[PDB]
Each structure stands twice: as structure tokens, then as C-alpha cells.
Design a protein around this ligand. Sequence first.
Ligand SMILES: Cc1cn([C@H]2C[C@H](O)[C@@H](COP(=O)(O)OP(=O)(O)O[C@H]3O[C@H](C)[C@@H](N)[C@H](O)[C@H]3O)O2)c(=O)[nH]c1=O
Ligand SMILES: Cc1cn([C@H]2C[C@H](O)[C@@H](COP(=O)(O)OP(=O)(O)O[C@H]3O[C@H](C)[C@@H](N)[C@H](O)[C@H]3O)O2)c(=O)[nH]c1=O
Lengths: 246, 245
Amino acid sequence: PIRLLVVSDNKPLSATLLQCIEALAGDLTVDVDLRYTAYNHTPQSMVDLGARVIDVKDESVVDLIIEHYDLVLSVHCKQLFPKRLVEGVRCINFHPGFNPFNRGWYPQAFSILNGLPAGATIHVMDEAIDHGHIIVQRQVEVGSGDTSLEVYNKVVEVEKALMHECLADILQGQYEVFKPLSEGNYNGIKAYNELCQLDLEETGSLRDHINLLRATSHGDFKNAYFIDESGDKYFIKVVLEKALRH
Amino acid sequence: SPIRLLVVSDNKPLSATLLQCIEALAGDLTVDVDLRYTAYNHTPQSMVDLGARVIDVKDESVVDLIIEHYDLVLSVHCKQLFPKRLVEGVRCINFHPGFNPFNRGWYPQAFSILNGLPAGATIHVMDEAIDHGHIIVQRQVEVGSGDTSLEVYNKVVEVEKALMHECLADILQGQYEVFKPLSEGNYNGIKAYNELCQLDLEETGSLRDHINLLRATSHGDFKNAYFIDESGDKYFIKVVLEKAL
Ligand SMILES: Cc1cn([C@H]2C[C@H](O)[C@@H](COP(=O)(O)OP(=O)(O)O[C@H]3O[C@H](C)[C@@H](N)[C@H](O)[C@H]3O)O2)c(=O)[nH]c1=O
Ligand SMILES: Cc1cn([C@H]2C[C@H](O)[C@@H](COP(=O)(O)OP(=O)(O)O[C@H]3O[C@H](C)[C@@H](N)[C@H](O)[C@H]3O)O2)c(=O)[nH]c1=O
């Protein structure tokens, strides 16, 4: 009877994970707790799935997790698991990036700027961020027309496909792991906020400037901004459309 | 003897506003209106809904029947250049969505976003050259730092309607001091706008310059600016801006 804690700030991936587990209840008994984190400013969609808050950095919560669970799954979790937690119980992260490339924040946004692989990685969690040995990953192609939104949605679909394909093996420990070929590059939220903070005076190719806007364009999120002569702040995004082929 | 007015227009909203301003005068000074859309208008349903029919203002038989049968011709956002024998044959007056003589010709607010020259609306007597003649009334519109072609254009269209409510009586009745523009500023053809739309991804400049090119070529659902990637796939690109709340 596998005791599973899922720690997630993402409703659609959590819903998919709960459905995959329910579909396995014929061959494999799993007791699931679902939790979201303190950083979730807008948690009602998780609450609707039966979740409540966990502070994974709280030392008593760490004690209790190591006691009560065989396995912790991090799915788009907004909190750093502390050292004693990842060394105390098996912790596996679903990361919307292709490790070890653009580890950290909004990987597909950096992949649009720098050409590094985009995709999804399921990996063992160590003390470092998006850093432990890889269980499985799959690349997504970044199209010329894509913004952050289109690449992110393809990454989320690939994560759902990996859950469906691999969840039985992950729950049962039936897999080998591989060390990333290098440490790779890490992007913190500071590096993203500097992307968003446009310099109207900066000089570059139209390509680099369009790529910067594409990286920061994500549906209705207010990301990239300039501030004009009168100190008015304007958010800017690009919208792209493939021309009809005739 | 009612004023025999020819309105040539390919724009329904401005034509709607003009007809409305005219019946507001119905009481005091009377007008016989013929409303026409140009032979260069291939989607004229919105003008037909206003009771308009086609005029080809380059058909010599048509320009004959014009000089004989009207006192005044109003051009309001019409897709044809008026011949010489027409514009001398009558008082021909144009409603221009630019602040003459800056960015005369096509889509003025687009070129104003690029080159920072004033934008707005100009009612000008029509001479031989495009958007050149002596100016009756004009109003600048503010180019907001967050505005695209669409926002500036909509501000110009409202000023054009304002100028119609304020100035039409005096325009139909000759009641104005026309003036020469302090210079002849600059003209922009359809070529120059399509050259903006054909983005060069290798071109180098300020992010300000690049954002201003996208803003200039962004206009709601019109497919304007585009690039072609390595595989030869074409993508249209626009910018969408929002003042912070
Ligand atoms: C909050 C925010 C999000 N986004 C875009 C880019 C992101 O890749 C995408 C999803 O971000 P999200 O936070 O809305 O939803 P999630 O993909 O579920 O993000 C969650 O798990 C990630 C692995 C963590 N880095 C996040 O901090 C955590 O909230 O939305 C933006 O473009 N701007 C934003 O301000
Ligand atoms: C057709 C077209 C229009 N536009 C924008 C910029 C224009 O300033 C604006 C309106 O042009 P419009 O043709 O829809 O509507 P109008 O304002 O009625 O323009 C009319 O009077 C003008 C004096 C002529 N130059 C135009 O050819 C004629 O159609 O829409 C675009 O950005 N792209 C386009 O392909």
C-alpha cells in the first residue's frame, strides 16, 4: 500500500496525476495526499481537487513527511524541498524543462531566446534545483511562430504523456536513472524579471528583439514592460499567426 | 435652389456621421446629397447599406456628368485620386486622417508612430497633388506611447466626426479662411507601407525603433507585418500593449 504525497501548484497536471493513479487501482494500491504550497497566491483550483496547503520547509512537516510517506511527487511545485527532506525520502520532480538546459524558471521562455532544448523531465530531487538524476525526458520543438504560451502548452501535454506512460514504474521504483551530461545553465526569477524589464535604448537585430518579445509573451500574463517619458508603464506582447498556404 | 452635393466615400462610419450632420441642418440650410463609393471599392456592402452606388471618378463620361450636376464634392476616405479636369471642374474638398502636410498619403498615423511627426485630421481644399491643397481646419491627436495604428486611427476618426459636427455648415457655405501649410512636409505611398510590413530579421537598431515599427504596422485583425523563417514559412506578427493598472 504505497503512501504517496503529491505536492503541486498546477491543477491540470494534478488532475491528470490523480486520474492515472485511479486507473492503476486495479494492480497497485496507492493512498494519495494532495497538497499545494504557501507560495500559491491563488489556490482555489487546487482546493477544488481536495488539496490543502503544506510548508515543505517547516522542520515538523519534514519529520512528518519522512514518517507518513513512501514517495513524494513534486508537480510544478513553487517551493524548494530542503536537504533533509530529499535525503530522507524518495522525492521525484516533474519539471517543464529538458534538464540540464534552462534549469529553473520558465524554461521554454529561455529556450525561445537561447535555442537550448525545451521539453519535460522527470528526475530525482537532490538539494540543488532541477539537478538530480533523470528518470525520463522528452524534447518539444520550438516553432518560429511560437510564444512562451505555445511551447509551455506542448510541454504540459508531454508531461501528461509521461505520467500515463511511466507512473506505474515511478510508483514501484522500477527504473534506472542517468546523471545529466553537465551541470547546465540555471535561470532564477531575477533573470526572467530582467528579460521583462525592457531597455528601449538597447541595440540588436530585429530577430533578437522579436525573440525577446516571443519569450515574454504568454497569453494574458503581464510580463515585458517599458516606462515612457512621463513614467507610464506599458506591458507589451507579440501575437503571431502562420500565413495561410496557397 | 438647394446645394447639389456629391459625397464620394469608401468609409461607412464617416459617411453615416456626415449624413447625420446634414439632416441636423435640414431645418436651416437645405442640401441634395448623392452618396457614392469608388470603383476601387471591392467590398462596398457597408456603403450600399447607406444607399450608395458606384462611381468611377476616372470615367470621362462620369466626370462630364459630375461637373454639370453638382456645386460641391466632398471626398471622405475614398480609394480614388480625382482627375485634374474634375478637381478644377468643381470645388472638391477632402477629409484626410492626417495632420497636413506631415505624413500625407497612405495610413498617416502608421508613419507618425515611426517618424514622430504630428498625427490628426485635416479638411483641405483638393488641389492637383495628393493631400496638398489649402487647409480649412485641422486638429492634432496625441500619439500615446502604448498606441498602435488602431488606437491613433480611431482617435483621428472621432476628430473627423467632431470636425463634421463643428464645421459642416461653414464648409457647405464657403465660410472659411483656407491657409497654405508652413511647408509641404512629406508624402507616403502604398509601396512605403508594404516595405515596412516586409520585416528584415537581420536589420540592426534600437528596441525602441523595433517596437515603433511593430506598433506602426499593428492594426487590430489586419495581417500587416510578417517575416519568413529558414524553411520559407510566413508568419504575421503584431504587438498588443496595455497601460499598467
Ligand atoms: C506567473 C506567470 C506565469 N507565466 C507563464 C510562464 C510559465 O512557464 C507558465 C506557467 O507558470 P505558472 O506559475 O502560471 O503555472 P505552473 O507551470 O504550474 O508554475 C508552477 O510550477 C513551476 C515549475 C514553478 N516555477 C512555478 O513557480 C509554479 O507556479 O505561465 C508568465 O508568463 N508570467 C507569469 O507571471
Ligand atoms: C486595408 C488595411 C488597413 N489598415 C489600417 C490602416 C488604415 O489607416 C486604416 C483604415 O484603412 P481602411 O482602408 O480600412 O479604411 P479607410 O479609413 O476607410 O481608408 C480609406 O480612405 C483612405 C484615404 C485610403 N487610403 C484607403 O485606401 C481607403 O480604404 O486601417 C491596415 O493596417 N492594413 C490594411 O491592410
